[PDB]
Each structure stands twice: as C-alpha cells, then as structure tokens.
Design a protein around this ligand. Structure first.
Ligand SMILES: O=C(O)CCC(=O)C(=O)O
Ligand SMILES: [Fe+3]
Length: 184
C-alpha cells in the first residue's frame, strides 16, 4: 500500500506542535487516580468519557500546561470548553479523520499511561507522517495540521520504534488520552 506516497518529517506539517514531558508525574498520577475506575478496564475495547465544564481540579489543571501563546492565538486567551477522555487497550485505534468543524481551530491532546504512534495522512499530496505520542506529552494540532491533514492511531498491538540505531517492536499498553477543544 501507499507506494505512490512519501513519508515526510512531522516538522513539515504547519500547526503541529509536540511537547514531550509536558506534564509532571505528579500531575499524571493525580489525574489517573481520579478517573472513574470503570474507565480504565483492561478488558475488550477502551472506554471513553465526555466531560463538560466546570471540570474538577485533576482535569482542569491541564489547561495550565497548554502554552499561553496557543490559547491567545486560537482560543481568545481562554481555556478549553469540551473535553473527551479515551482509553486505548492494546489493538485499539482510531480511523483517519479530521476533527469536526463544530470545534474550530486548535486541538490539544494530552497523553497518559503509555506511548503510541499517530499517523498523519494527506491524500491529495500523497504524504504520510508519523509521530510517537509519549506518556506525559502534549500535542497541539491547528491550521494546516488540523484542516489539511487526516490523523489516525493504527489498530495494532505494537509499533516499530527506532531508537539508538536499532528498531524494535514495542508492545502497546493501555493508554489514556485527554482531548481538549473549544466549541466555535
Ligand atoms: O486520543 C487521541 O490521541 C486522538 C483522539 C482524536 O483524534 C479525537 O478525539 O478526534
Ligand atoms: Fe481527532
């Protein structure tokens, strides 16, 4: 598949900003301790959970780790209004998509528990790009990244990851994302 396509660096995609080790461990633990225990079930397919403001502190504090320059530029200096928490047990993913127009520009994703791989697709350009979303990271998607490209998480139970010159198949563990957006 995709023999007509090129894989380019994620840096070539305007409006993708990635911040490894954005959340202190203390913040990650406080959030995870405070999610309903049913949400983190290891069995079958990961569950999801919509939350609407006012958010409790263990969520709401995530607003503080979204860079101010992003919120000013796109969110009117304000904080997130809609939040979705999604669990991914090994083998879970999401098909390529662009986020719904009801949200307008600037999407923040916080990652918890374990690492995964997200793939960006531009069918008109015939390009792919990939980013490793690590535990504790923040991904901001806006502009070209958010309107021009699709994103997905492949449905599989590991990812090939290149590190220190070697490539290994890193098994997936349970992963939780928190996606923070505004309604336009
Ligand atoms: O959970 C993720 O990392 C991606 C979620 C997503 O793409 C979405 O909420 O539209
Ligand atoms: Fe999305």
């Amino acid at each position: 598949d995709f023999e007509n396509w090129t894989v380019v660096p994620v840096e070539t995609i305007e409006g993708i900003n990635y911040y490894p080790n954005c959340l202190p461990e203390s913040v990650q633990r406080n959030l995870i301790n405070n999610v309903p225990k049913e949400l983190l079930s290891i069995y079958g397919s990961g569950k999801q959970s919509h939350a609407y403001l006012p958010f409790p502190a263990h969520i709401n504090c995530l607003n503080d780790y979204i860079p101010s320059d992003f919120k000013q530029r796109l969110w009117k200096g304000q904080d997130a209004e809609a939040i979705i928490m999604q669990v991914y047990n090994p083998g879970d993913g999401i098909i390529p998509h662009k986020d719904l127009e009801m949200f307008g520009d600037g999407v923040a994703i916080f990652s918890f528990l374990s690492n995964t791989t997200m793939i960006f697709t531009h069918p008109e350009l015939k390009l792919k790009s990939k980013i490793r979303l690590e535990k504790g990271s923040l991904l901001l998607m806006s502009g070209t990244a958010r309107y021009d490209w699709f994103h997905e998480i492949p449905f599989r139970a590991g990812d090939w990851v290149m590190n220190d010159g070697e490539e290994k198949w890193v098994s997936r563990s349970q992963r939780l994302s928190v996606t923070m957006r505004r309604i336009i």
